A paper describes a structure:
Ornithine carbamoyltransferases (OTCs) are involved in the arginine deiminase (ADI) pathway and in arginine biosynthesis. Two OTCs in a pair are named catalytic OTC (cOTC) and anabolic OTC (aOTC). PAMC 21119. Here, we determined the Ps_cOTC and Ps_aOTC structures from the psychrophilic bacteria Psychrobacter sp. PAMC 21119 at 2.6 and 2.2 Å and compared them in respect to the substrate preferences for kinetic processes and cooperativity.
In contrast, aOTC catalyzes the biosynthesis of citrulline from CP and ornithine in vivo and is thus involved in arginine biosynthesis. Most of the amino acids were built, except for the SMG loop region (nine amino acids) between S8 and H10 because of ambiguous electron density. In detail, His131 from H6; Asn162 and Met163 from H7; the Cys259, Leu260, and Ala262 from the HCLP loop; and Arg55 from H3 are the main residues creating the potential binding cleft for the CP and ORN of Ps_aOTC. In the Ps_aOTC structure, the 80s loop (81–LGRGEP–86) is leaning against the H5 of the B chain starting from the sharp turn of P86. Conversely, Ps_aOTC forms a potential binding cavity for CP. The clear CP and ORN binding sites provided by the lack of closed residues from the 80s loop in the Ps_aOTC probably allow the CP molecule to slip into the binding site.
Author numbering:
A (entry chain A), B (entry chain A), C (entry chain A): 2 to 223, 233 to 304
The structure:
């Protein structure tokens, strides 16, 4: 019975498509001022082993809009140490709240937390995978261009940040991914091989962009010499499908800014990427607690 | 369309009078146990570049009573650095929440935040101006003595704390202000000149108090030699209008205490000054989001 | 009129029995998914002079389930310094919120806070007494075995942690307590004498366990040489009443773990002890604010 969201594949292809569609409907409802409160009396526990303000604000805002409450556990509040400290945090917190989101770095830590939880666990982000941001990215594409099935997606930059999430998503959402990575900054071959069905490595960014429906990048405006040809410009977007949309990993560290040209370009959906963390996560919480609804 | 509260004059004289009257009605409603929840599904973002527990508790309590939720962003949560860090915090937070209060020190920072916000901004307090406390002070006067229009207000102390807020309020609420400031601790002449229409500088505290309807002070009980004659006592209140009320800036730093004599004096409305941050801010949030109500 | 919960005896024997019974009914309601929201528009202020995550999560979750909001004041937010800083925090916070829980160490501090509060004060825990955990422990016993009146309770370990709370509870809930304390780690004689009516000191843990209905311990699995015979095992439980239940102080410091044998033993109610902080505190808040209900 008890379903978690630890990795993207914990939902079937159809559940993922229904979720993104549901997130778009929840976004229209909130903006139209509809009151939808299926979680009156319900509580979200938010466990942050490492801080993410974007995660925290979006989850807290979401559960509130649904009539529930969110409990913010900051790193040095509760014991996340491997062993009993982890498993006892899980059983006790889940006897009190109805759903838990966790931000940790152990991929084995989130699995152990889940095993001892009586309630659904959401893995918001780990150090390797960003499943909540990836859901928000797929919602944003869907809202501007419909279904991404059999579309072409071009990742521009290294194998860090959301690269692995996009590679993982290719198979699940049914798209073709090209990774345009600078020489010496390619993803792990072992990863490439895992997703070799849907994903290909392409040095030439101009060729990778050809016929792309979505261009997504973690390359920050100005190592810098090596990334300079991987800077996404209006010029690069001109080589894509005329229906191309542009996404950019949102700023994570000081100095990371996206050019005005790319934010203001009419093909850019960066601001929806950030807002849709709210709506995509509401769709996810609604899905995991649906047997508590109505 | 989009209206902010960055400075007192962002509301007309009549809106300010309606707001104070509305705050008094909201206070009676809450105390009578009336449930008034126009903000079900709505969120307040509270941005603190510098901490104010009094601001935080009052806003959080207010939005909660209205059926909404408040998100507490502490200083080193979100990026308030001048430039893009500021403007991107604004656009993204306002795509998710319905109203933002900000506590900063830049008067240019709150204006820039407002320019890029899709939602109303409340400037709770800056390092120079205390517009939320000033609304609570005007509510408190109104509740005990009615309209302050054509009344006499006497500020006793230096040009710090709420002095500039009172000088600014004189013109907007239509009162005459005397600043009774010790020699060498007078407000900036340039300020005095700005508000020279409604505001006068008066050394003799006894003369300043003559016919006063409200005496307000930032002079803390026992430099100290120089302030000693500017200590507000029952004696000084005896020289005012028999209807005079007494207010005192609330404690901001360790060691700042108000005498028992002044707190317990029947003309003292200090405790209402503190409580009415709750009600005045509810009136303000209701005003700025009224097109979302009903 | 105004009633506080500063110590267990602030409620009569019958109010305590009604509260534990009410907590059990509230637990069944929440688990059955009943919406019970008597505190729409109401606020809990949570003052932590010393941090307790277990207290914070349980209170915050409880007030939320009841439709209210909880304000989390962390140590260095508000001034708890003895004198005016304490009494002014009390009067102002209570003019805004409807109920306050306080975690302090002064037994004179919680009394002074209460004297100047216009609203009910809950003393969640002090450094000596754990009245909220003790209510959760009495709920847990009641749910598994009914009334504890005229039952035998055996405390195994030193005079720290919940020992004094159990000694205090003996008289109020009408049970007989044996303290099985290792030589040189007995409670204060002056305490023993205070509760000498209901409480006895018994060195031999085997004899103390004889006919016990509840065995409770703060002895942590492996000074250690001296506590080793005071380790509660399935063996020790075999010498008690066949209806015996086992409780254990919940972990407070790093290294404090309860054996798997004792957690998984069918007589162990440790997990209910932790969950019932939620339900017992809801029963308490409902009792203290009942004249605001319906």
């Amino acid at each position: 019975s008890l379903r978690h969201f630890l990795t993207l594949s914990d939902l079937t292809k159809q559940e993922l498509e229904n979720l993104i569609k549901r997130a778009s409907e929840l976004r229209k409802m909130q903006h139209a001022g509809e009151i939808y409160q299926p979680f009156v009396g319900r509580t979200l526990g938010m466990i942050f082993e490492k801080s993410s303000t974007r995660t925290r604000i979006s989850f807290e805002t979401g559960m509130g809009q649904f009539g529930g409450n969110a409990i913010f556990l900051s790193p040095n509040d509760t014991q996340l140490g491997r062993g009993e400290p982890l498993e006892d945090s899980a059983r006790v917190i889940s006897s009190m709240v109805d759903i838990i989101m966790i931000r940790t770095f152990g991929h084995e830590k989130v699995e152990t937390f889940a095993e001892y939880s009586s309630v659904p666990i959401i893995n918001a982000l780990t150090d390797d995978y960003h499943p909540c941001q990836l859901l928000a990215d797929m919602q944003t594409y869907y809202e501007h261009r419909g279904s991404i099935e059999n579309k072409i997606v071009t990742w521009v930059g290294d194998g860090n940040n959301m690269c692995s999430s996009f590679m993982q998503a290719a198979n699940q959402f049914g798209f073709e991914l090209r990774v345009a990575a600078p020489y010496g900054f390619e993803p792990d071959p072992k990863l490439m091989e895992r997703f070799s069905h849907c994903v290909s490595l392409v040095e030439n960014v101009q060729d990778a962009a050809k016929d792309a429906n979505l261009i997504v990048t973690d390359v920050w405006a100005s190592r810098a010499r090596r990334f300079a040809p991987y800077q996404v410009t209006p010029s690069l977007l001109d080589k894509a499908d005329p229906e191309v949309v542009f996404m950019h990993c949102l700023p994570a560290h000081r100095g990371e800014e996206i050019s005005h040209d790319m934010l203001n370009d009419p093909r850019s959906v960066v601001w929806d990427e950030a807002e849709n963390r709210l709506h995509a996560q509401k769709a996810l919480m609604e899905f995991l607690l649906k047997d508590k609804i109505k």
